[PDB]
Amino acid sequence: MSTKLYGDVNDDGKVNSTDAVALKRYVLRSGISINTDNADLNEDGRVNSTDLGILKRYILKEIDTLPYKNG
Numbered sequence: 001m002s003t004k005l006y007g008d009v010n011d012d013g014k015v016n017s018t019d020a021v022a023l024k025r026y027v028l029r030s031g032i033s034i035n036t037d038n039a040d041l042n043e044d045g046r047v048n049s050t051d052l053g054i055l056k057r058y059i060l061k062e063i064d065t066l067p068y069k070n071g
């Protein structure tokens with residue numbers, strides 16, 4: 001009916017360290033199944049470290065818009 005998430009791995013909430021498991025598998029190659037659709041936002045794939053941060057940064061609670069920023 002309604003949900004808020006952007007770039008989820010296991011469609012839990014978002015792609016972060018928590019989804020590092022599927023990440024390691026994804027980083028190595030494309031074998032698993034993840035919502036890579038809107039998982040990448042810097043042509044990386046998911047969260048190599050640049051997004052990971054912004055993720056744990058916005059996913060902290062702001063999870064709704066995600067103030068995508070560099071750092």
Ligand SMILES: [Ca+2]
Nearest residue numbers: 012013014019
């Ligand atoms: Ca998740």
Ligand SMILES: [Ca+2]
Nearest residue numbers: 040041042051
């Ligand atoms: Ca990314």
